[PDB]
Amino acid sequence: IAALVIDNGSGMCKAGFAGDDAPRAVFPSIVGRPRHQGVMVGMGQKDSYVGDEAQSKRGILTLKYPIEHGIVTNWDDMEKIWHHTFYNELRVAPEEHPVLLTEAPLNPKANREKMTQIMFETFNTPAMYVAIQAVLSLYASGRTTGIVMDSGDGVTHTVPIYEGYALPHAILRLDLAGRDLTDYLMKILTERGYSFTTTAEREIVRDIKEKLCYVALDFEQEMATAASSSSLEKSYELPDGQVITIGNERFRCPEALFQPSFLGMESCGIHETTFNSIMKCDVDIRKDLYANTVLSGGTTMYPGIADRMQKEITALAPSTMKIKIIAPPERKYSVWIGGSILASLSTFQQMWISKQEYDESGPSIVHRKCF
């Protein structure tokens, strides 16, 4: 029997089977319904498009995003996203597969129950479990104590974890993530003179970001190299055939993580967030958090991020302090990977929430078996 692992994380959902080292399905967390009724005619009681097919038809559809900040907000839409992942992306009967699911930090109590009611009542799984995204990411690096920085599409989180437990008094949420960066890249490339302003143009910039942006080790130094050399300018072939060139924009976009002001945001950068998070913990565990900063997600996926963070936290931490940033190359799907390891561990078989338990105790059973 195979267990399913679904990371409903921010904008992109990662699903697949436990044991595998990669998800089989990744797709946007997007639901659209017809804008006008004339398009439902003769379409067999279908009413909805979910995921990729909803992005292709955004012209004929009104799109809704249920988990833009990692917290589910529309449960009617989230059921359709889950139907789509079980029946269409995975091509599986969820009643045959125990399902490990994933939740943001500081997820409100009501939401864990609702998730559990739907997973059991609507899809009729035999077992289920809920883990915190950042904790699984720690597990995928073989740790149970550290501080994870989880950053995907719409939300960034610094999560101190001690012995498998996310410390609720030090969790910090940053409302600056991948999609805030793709928009800045557009702005600054439009300021050079190449125009990116339509929804189809955003998607182009999202590719140039993922393929050509990196994190400078010293912002000021790299700017100098750019203005005094061409070594770093790179070229990109556009869909029309046009070749645009990318200069200092390649590193000025991910700089917004350490310098959020570039976007009109007065909050602090992902390095000071890490410090601040670590300072809301007992000094008696900080040594362990410093030595185990784990980077996680699609926004952590820029060349040179780990070297940079090491240098920034080294400048905020005490002098005598072993600082280690861990940022695997598979770091984009590190949550999902933690899920697959956990769900395929022998001892976790005893740790599922069973259909029997759900019928006996109701959706609140989630609070007693999933910390």
Partner 1 sequence: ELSISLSLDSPKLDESDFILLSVKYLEKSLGKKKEFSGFFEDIEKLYFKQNYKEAIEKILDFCKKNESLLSEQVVQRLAEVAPRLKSNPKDNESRRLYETLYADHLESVIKQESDLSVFNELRDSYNAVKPEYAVTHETEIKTLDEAKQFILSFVMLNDNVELPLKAQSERYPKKDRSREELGNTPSANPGIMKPNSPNFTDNLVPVRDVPKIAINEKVAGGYSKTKPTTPFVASLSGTTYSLMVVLTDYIEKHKTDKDIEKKVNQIINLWISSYIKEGYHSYSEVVDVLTEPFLQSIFDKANIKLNYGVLDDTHAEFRKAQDYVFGLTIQSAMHHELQERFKNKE
Query: Which residues of this chain interact with partner 1, rule CB under 8 A?
Result: 109, 112, 139, 142, 144, 162-165, 167-170, 280-282, 285, 341-342, 345-348, 350-351, 364, 366-371
Alpha-carbon distance values, 20 to 83, 336, 347, 355 (Å):
21, 10, 18, 25
Q: How far is it, in rounded angstroms, from Cα 180 to Cα 186?
A: 10
195 annotated as a binding-site residue: no
Instruction: Specify the residue, 228 or 350, whose C-beta has the smaller distance to partner 1.
Output: 350
Token pair of 367, please?
A: 């609070």
Instruction: Specify the residue, 22 or 39, whose C-beta has the smaller distance to partner 1.
Output: 22
11 annotated as a binding-site residue: yes
332 annotated as a binding-site residue: yes
CB of 367 to partner 1, least distance (A): 4
CB of 370 to partner 1, least distance (A): 8
CB of 364 to partner 1, least distance (A): 7
14 annotated as a binding-site residue: yes
CB of 357 to partner 1, least distance (A): 11
Q: How far is it, in rounded angstroms, from Cα 246 to Cα 239?
A: 16
Instruction: Specify the residue, 315 or 345, whose C-beta has the smaller distance to partner 1.
Output: 345
CB of 347 to partner 1, least distance (A): 4
255 annotated as a binding-site residue: no
153 annotated as a binding-site residue: yes
Instruction: Specify the residue, 27 or 333, whose C-beta has the smaller distance to partner 1.
Output: 333
10 annotated as a binding-site residue: yes
Instruction: Specify the residue, 109 or 322, whose C-beta has the smaller distance to partner 1.
Output: 109
CB of 23 to partner 1, least distance (A): 20
Instruction: Specify the residue, 15 or 171, whose C-beta has the smaller distance to partner 1.
Output: 171
CB of 140 to partner 1, least distance (A): 9
210 annotated as a binding-site residue: yes
Instruction: Specify the residue, 272 or 357, whose C-beta has the smaller distance to partner 1.
Output: 357
Q: Which residues are annotated as a binding site for ATP?
A: 10-12, 14, 153, 209-210, 298, 332
Q: Which residues are annotated as a binding site?
A: 10-12, 14, 153, 209-210, 298, 332
